[PDB]
Amino acid sequence: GNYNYQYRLFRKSNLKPFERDISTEIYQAGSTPCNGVEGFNCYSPLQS
């Protein structure tokens, strides 16, 4: 089980040519406020 390879699942907006992002904040997929770490409509920025 190779579980070290990850990528992005939701993003606020598209990147630029040759631009790098290492963000880890949780994405607010819904419009509700999301705090702490875990909640509904906001679970994880990346996926393996």
Partner 1 sequence: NIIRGWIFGTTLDSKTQSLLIVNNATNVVIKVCEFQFCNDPFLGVYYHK
Partner 2 sequence: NIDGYFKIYSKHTPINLVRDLPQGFSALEPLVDLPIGINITRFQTLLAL
Ligand X SMILES: *[C@@H]1O[C@H](CO)[C@@H](O[C@@H]2O[C@H](CO)[C@@H](O[C@@H]3O[C@H](CO)[C@@H](O)[C@H](O)[C@@H]3O)[C@H](O)[C@H]2NC(C)=O)[C@H](O)[C@H]1NC(C)=O
Report the interface residues with partner 1, using CB under 8 A: 20, 22-23, 25
Considering the complex, what minimum distance in angstroms separates the CB of residue 19 from ligand X? 7
For residue 4, give every residue at least 6 positions away whose Cβ sits within 8 Å of its Cβ, in sequence order, or none.
48
Interaction of residue 12 with partner 2, rule CB under 8 A: no
**7 sits in which H/E element:** strand 7-8
Instruction: Select from ligand X, partner 2, partner 1, none the partner in contact with residue 18, using the beta carbon and a kind-dependent cut-off of 5 to 8 Å.
Output: partner 2
Q: Rounded to an integer, what distance in angstroms lies between the CA atom of residue 18 and that of residue 13?
A: 15
Considering the complex, what minimum distance in angstroms separates the CB of residue 3 from ligand X? 28
